[PDB]
Amino acid sequence: MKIKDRKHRVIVCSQKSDVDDNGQLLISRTGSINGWAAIEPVKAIRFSKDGVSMQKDTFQPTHDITMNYNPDVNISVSAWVYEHRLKSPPRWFKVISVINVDECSQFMRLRSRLVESNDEVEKPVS
Amino acid sequence: MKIKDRKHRVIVCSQKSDVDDNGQLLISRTGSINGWAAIEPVKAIRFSKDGVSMQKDTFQPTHDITMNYNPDVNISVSAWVYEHRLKSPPRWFKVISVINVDECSQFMRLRSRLVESNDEVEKPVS
Amino acid sequence: MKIKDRKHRVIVCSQKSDVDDNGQLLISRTGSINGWAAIEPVKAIRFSKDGVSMQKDTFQPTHDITMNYNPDVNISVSAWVYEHRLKSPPRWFKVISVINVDECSQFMRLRSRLVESNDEVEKPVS
Amino acid sequence: MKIKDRKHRVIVCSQKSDVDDNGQLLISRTGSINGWAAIEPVKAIRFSKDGVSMQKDTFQPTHDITMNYNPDVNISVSAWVYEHRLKSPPRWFKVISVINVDECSQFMRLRSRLVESNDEVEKPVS
Amino acid sequence: MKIKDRKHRVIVCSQKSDVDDNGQLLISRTGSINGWAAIEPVKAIRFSKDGVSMQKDTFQPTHDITMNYNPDVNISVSAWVYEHRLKSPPRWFKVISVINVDECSQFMRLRSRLVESNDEVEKPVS
Amino acid sequence: MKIKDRKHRVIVCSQKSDVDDNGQLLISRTGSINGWAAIEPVKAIRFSKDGVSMQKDTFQPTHDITMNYNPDVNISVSAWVYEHRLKSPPRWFKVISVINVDECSQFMRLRSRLVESNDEVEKPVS
Amino acid sequence: KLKLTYSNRLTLPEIAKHIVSPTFHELEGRAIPVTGVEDDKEGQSAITKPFALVGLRIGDTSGPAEIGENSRINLRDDFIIEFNFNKDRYKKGGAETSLFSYYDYESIRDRLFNAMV
């Protein structure tokens, strides 16, 4: 992959969650990694009135995200991804699985599913 | 996507619906976007006596529509598309899902299902 | 499509049907369009003793027929196609569905199923 | 289809069958068309101790046989094919379905299933 | 096929079987053909502690074997194949189906299932 | 294969297992072969909080490992693979099945499933 | 004698320890209780042969099982014992025994039932 591709700027976060008193499930998320990334679509989506994706089976990836491989990182299930852009609303991604471009061990590619895109999206806890 | 391709002129509408006294459902569609667009077929069609499509599993698209991407727009489930041509009868498309040509964010491509084509078709509310 | 392709001469007909006194169904077919057309097979055929096709899944097409797109025509379910050739016995096609070669709107392509080929075939009503 | 291809010499036949007194069904095969042909395998074969093919799904074709298209023939269900060779034992083919190479109507291709190959095979009734 | 390809030396055998007094079944295999052959893998294998292949669905092949076509031979279900190599242990193949390279009738190709490979393999009855 | 490909250094081990007093199963793994090998990914992975792979359908392989074919070795079910790298945490592969690159018998290719990758992973019994 | 966890039923480890291991000497132990037969065709087959697994099938009820109410409570436990053995091939008279041939199970059944009794 060439340098110029990585147009997009993203924030990688981890998830910690607990239970409200009412029984509702609360999610809070913190940024952990910074860098540029390259993003490609894989599947069409359809938005609700406020841009929350509708999908069955809930873990068929839609966007492929690639960035520099980091041996000191150990991605796991609880990952997320964040992207705030020039004009378009901020967007959340959920990480389904990981893959090295090759065992040359130079670039880390994530399979992801889009979730939300609207002005009210919570921004990652810094 | 070269300039010359966008032969077709289309009007994008939003749907507003309610209930008659007899319980039957009513539809109203309001033009919100106008511009040139390019159209490609994807699947065959089977017309009734008055040209209304005949399909089950309506979630599958038939025609691909491409036009300029717009960051200030939020396409959603309730979309439609309208097209009036020089000689051919007016036609209604229903929008299934959306996709960027790439994350380059230049062109927005819709996947649509053809519904009607005949002289009696209502024209979009101005 | 090139000009030379359209070797075959065909007659497109509409169907009119009713009920005999005995309760059986009678069919009548009316000639409505004349012109040359190009034909391509898609699937093998199995002929009975008198050449009447034999297929389950009647919706599966066998032959693609291509001819000039006509904006003033509205092909629909009740279509047929008739063809009389130099030496070969006549043949009836049943139209399954329609498709523009592209939205350029120049040529109309039909998906068809073969029915009969023998000397006793009824010729289209003039 | 170049001239040199049609190595093989084949005898096309029609089937005539009846019932013995014991209730077992008798078959008689008559020769009707002569000519050269080209043959291509499509699927593997499993031979019993005396070469009679062993396979379920009897509709599955195995060998494609091509020869000159004949407008004055009405190949149908009851067809067969017979072929005798220089050293290898004779073989019977059962015709499954027919197809023109194209609507150019020059060459007739048959889809066939191999049945028998051994020295005791009956030769076509002349 | 080129001459150089046929690296491997093989022995084609026939199977004769009977019943012990205890009721278990006995196998003995007789060499009938000798010659060079070319072998290609088609599927992966899993070996038990002593190399006997483990896989359900016995009917699917694993290795393709090609040798000179022979009109005076009639391969059948009861075939086998044997091969002893320079260093690696012997191996038994079971023959599934058969196919000419083409109806040119020059080379016979077998589809085989690997069974065993170890030092204790019984060698073909001469 | 080219020489430069085999970047990775691996240790191939055999498994020995027994039963604790509590009824749980204990595994012991022994180094038996060492050498350079080349690795390719085939499928995505999903890591638990400590990098242990999460996936059912255990017969599914993920990484392809190739190394010099050894006629004096008899790979079998109980195989494994071990790899310690410069910075990345160690990793255990479980061998699913084996295949020669060709019957030329130069290189042995394994199909493997990744299991673990973390600092606590045991090292092969020398 | 032994010491049982409960008074009137046995957990799967207890089965694997006291009914299977002491009866079948062929198994040098290796009567292994497992959560369930799920990781089979390429996870468990690597175990040295012969060996036997013990795993719950489904917990179930044989009648009324309303918790709390002062009436008896009935429970069921479905579990499966699955063995694994090689094949002997004695190759008498220049002929091998076929890869598939009758294998004696009656003796195994009799031994197991006698031990359970």
Tokens coding G54:
């013990």
- DSSP helix/strand/coil, E116: strand
Do residues D64 and D109 lie in contact, with contact meaning Cβ atoms separated by under 8 Å? yes
Chains A and C touch (3+ CB pairs under 8 A): no
Burial category of D41 from C-beta neighbours within 10 Å (exposed 0-12, middle 13-18, buried 19 and up): middle
Distance from CA of F123 to the nearest CA of G (A): 20
Chain F residues with CB under 8 Å of A74 CB are 47, 51, 89, 118
Place of tokens 């044997």: E82
Q: How far is CA D117 from CA D27, D91, E76, E112, G110, in A?
A: 17, 5, 12, 22, 53
Cα-based torsion angle of the residue sequence B4, B6, B9, B15 in order, rounded to the nearest 10 degrees: -160
> Both tokens of residue D105?
């109507």
- Other CB atoms within a 10 A radius of the CB of residue A77 amount to 14
Cα(B24)–Cα(B26) distance, rounded to whole angstroms? 7
How big is chain C, counted in residues? 126
> Between the CA atoms of F95, F101, F104 and F106, what dihedral angle is there, to the nearest 10 degrees?
-60
Residues of chain E in Cβ contact (below 8 Å) with chain F: 7-8, 39-41, 44-49, 51, 54, 63, 87-89, 118
Task: State the DSSP H helix or E strand holding residue E35, giving kind and residue range, or none if neither.
Answer: strand E25-41
Instruction: Check: CB of residue B83 under 8 Å from CB of residue B91.
Output: yes
- Is the minimum CB–CB distance between G48 and chain F shorter than 8 Å? yes
Amino acid letter at A5? D
Cα dihedral sign for G11, G12, G16, G20?
A: positive
Burial of E21 (0-12, 13-18, 19+ CB in 10 A): exposed
Q: Which tokens hold the place of F95?
A: 């061998």
On whether the CB atoms of residues F66 and F102 are closer than 8 A, the answer is no
Nearest-5° Cα angle at B23, B20 to B25: 60
Report long-range pairs for E100-106 (Cβ below 8 Å, ≥24 apart): E100/D41, E100/E69, E101/E1, E101/E66, E101/E69, E102/D40, E102/D41, E103/D7, E103/D8, E103/D38, E103/D39, E103/D40, E103/D41, E103/D63, E104/D7, E105/D88, E105/E69, E105/E71, E106/E68, E106/E69
Distance separating alpha carbons of residues E102 and E124, to the nearest angstrom: 31
The 3 state secondary structure assigned to chain C is CCCCCCCEEEEEEEEEEEECCCCCEEEEEEEEEEEEEEEEECCCECECCCCCECCCCCCCCCEEEEEECCCCCCCCCCEEEEECCCCCCCEEEEEEEEEECCCCCCEEEEEEEEEECCCCCCCCEC
Going by C-beta distance under 8 Å and a sequence separation of 6 or more, which residues neighbour residue D82?
D10, D11, D12, D13, D29, D31, D90, D91, D92, D93, D123, D124
DSSP E79: B
Query: Which residues of chain E does G92 touch, with a Cβ-Cβ cutoff of 8 Å?
Result: 20, 26
CB atoms near residue D120 (< 10 Å): 9
> Which SS3 state, helix, strand or coil, does residue G113 take?
helix
Facing residue for F59 by CB, picked from G29, G31, G41: G41
Which CA distances in Å does F17 have to D93, E87, E126, G31? 58, 32, 44, 12
Q: Measured in Å, how far apart are chain E's first and last C-alpha atoms?
A: 30
DSSP secondary structure of F42-67: -S-B-B-TT--B--S-TT---EEEEE
Give residue F3's Cα distance to chain centre: 21
The alpha carbon of residue F102 is apart from the nearest alpha carbon of chain E, in Å, by: 6
Total length of chain D: 126
How far apart CA D115 and CA D107 sit, in angstroms, is 24
Residues 6+ away with beta carbon under 8 Å from E126: E31
SS (H, E, C) B23-91: CCEEEEEEEEEEEEEEEEECCCECCCCCCCCCCCCCCCCCEEEEEECCCCCCCCCCEEEEECCCCCCCE
Name the residue of chain G whose CA is nearest to E47's CA.
G46
- Residue G42 φ/ψ, nearest 5 degrees: -140, 5
CA-nearest of C111, C83, C109, C108 to C97 is C111
Say how far apart CA D101 and CA D38 lie, in whole Å: 13
Q: DSSP per residue over A33-88, as a string?
A: EEEEEEEEE-S-B-B-TT--B--SSS----EEEEEE--TT----TTEEEEE--SSS
8-state DSSP, G117: -
With tokens 């992975």, the residue in question is F45
Q: Judging by beta carbons within 10 Å of its beta carbon (0-12, 13-18, 19+), is residue E122 exposed, middle or buried?
A: middle
G113 phi, psi to nearest 5 deg: -60, -40
- F106 forms beta bridges with none
CA–CA separation, E43 and B61 (whole Å):
38
Please give the Cα distance from C115 to C113 (Å, whole number): 6
Sheet holding G76-82, edge to edge: G31-34, G52-60, G76-82
| Interface touch E47/F75, C-beta < 8 Å | yes
Q: Is G95 touching E (CB cutoff 8 A)?
A: yes
Dihedral sign for Cα B32, B36, B42, B43, please: positive
In 10 A of CB B95, how many CB atoms?
21
Q: Mention every residue, 6+ apart, whose C-beta is less than 8 A from residue D5.
A: D38, D66
Are E47 and F111 within 8 A, CB to CB?
Answer: no
Q: Which residues of A touch B (CB under 8 A)?
A: 7-8, 39-41, 44-51, 54, 63, 85, 87-89, 118
Distance CA E103, CA D3 (A): 16
Q: H or E element: which one contains E112?
A: strand E107-116
Sequence-distant (6+) residues with CB within 8 A of C33 are C11, C12, C70, C73
Contact F8 A103 (CB under 8 A): yes
Nearest-angstrom CA–CA distance, G99 and E122: 13
Please name the residue that has the structure tokens 């690997």.
Answer: E114
Q: Which two tokens stand for residue C38?
A: 């190009």
Nearest CB to B88 within list C98, C99, C105: C105
CB contact under 8 A, F97 and E39: no
Tell how far CA D71 is from the center of its chain: 19
Rg (CA), chain D: 15
Give contacts of A103 with chain F, Cβ < 8 Å: 7-8, 39-41, 63
Tokens representing B82 are 């309208």
3-class DSSP state of A115: strand
Q: How many CB atoms lie within 10 A of CB G37?
A: 13
Q: Which residues of F touch A77 (CB under 8 A)?
A: 46-49, 54
Q: In residues, how long is chain E?
A: 126
- CA angle, A102 then A106 then A107, to 5°: 80
Q: At E5, is the secondary structure helix, strand, or coil?
A: helix
Type of residue found at F98 = V
Contacting residues of F for A100, CB less than 8 Å apart: 41
Rounded Cα–Cα distance for residues C30 and C14 (Å): 5
As given in the structure block, the two tokens for residue A115 are 């979730």
Angle at C122 between CA C116 and CA C126, to 5 degrees: 130
SS3 F38: strand
Cβ atoms within 10 Å, residue D4: 7
Backbone angles phi, psi at B44, to 5 degrees: -70, 165
What is the residue whose two structure tokens read 């209930």?
Answer: B19
Q: What is the DSSP string of chain D?
A: --GGG--EEEEEEEEEEEE-TTS-EEEEEEEEEEEEEEEEE-S-B-B-TT--B--S-TT---EEEEEE--TT----TTEEEEE--SSSPPEEEEEEEEEESSTT--EEEEEEEEEE-STTPPPPB-
> Which of B38, G53, D56 is closest to F24 using CA atoms?
G53
CB atoms within 10 A of CB D116: 19
Whether residues B46 and C71 touch (CB distance < 8 A) is answered with no
Assess contact for F85 and F10: CB atoms under 8 A: no
In whole angstroms, give the CA distance from residue B79 to residue B115. Answer: 13
* Beta-carbon separation of A87 and B96 below 8 A: no
For residue E8, give the chain F residue with the closest CA: F103
Q: Is F94 exposed, middle or buried (0-12, 13-18, 19+ CB in 10 A)?
A: buried
How remote is the C-alpha of C14 from its chain's centroid?
10
As given in the structure block, the two tokens for residue E99 are 């196919």
Query: Cα–Cα distance between C75 and C110 in angstroms, integer?
Result: 10
Nearest CA-CA distance, residue E81 and chain G, Å = 16
Q: State the SS3 of G35-88.
A: CCCCCHHHHHCCCCCCCEEEEEEEEECCCCCCCCCCCCCCCEEEEEEECCCCCC
G76 pairs with which residues across the strands?
Answer: G60
With contact defined as 3+ CB pairs under 8 Å, the chains touching D are C, E
Beta bridge partners, E25, equal E19
Given a contact cutoff of 8 angstroms between Cβ atoms, the answer to whether G31 and G20 are in contact is yes
How is residue E44 written in tokens?
């992966």
DSSP β-ladder status, G31-34 and G52-60: parallel
Q: Which residues of A87-106 are buried (b: 16+ CB within 10 A; e: fewer)?
A: ebbbbbbbbbbbbbeebebe
Cβ proximity of F110 and F33 under 8 Å: no
Which run of H or E residues covers position E8?
Answer: strand E8-19
Give the closest residue to G46 by CA, choosing from E48, D82, F62: E48
CA distance E124 to C50: 58
Q: What is the CA radius of gyration of chain G?
A: 19
Strands F63-68 and F91-100: unpaired
Contact residues on chain G for E47, CB-CB shorter than 8 A: none
DSSP state of F103: T
Contact F7 A98 (CB under 8 A): no
Q: Are D95 and D109 within 8 A, CB to CB? A: no
3-state secondary structure A94-111: EEEEEEECCCCCCEEEEE
- Structure tokens that stand for A101 in this block: 């471009």
- The secondary structure of residue E89, as a DSSP letter, is P
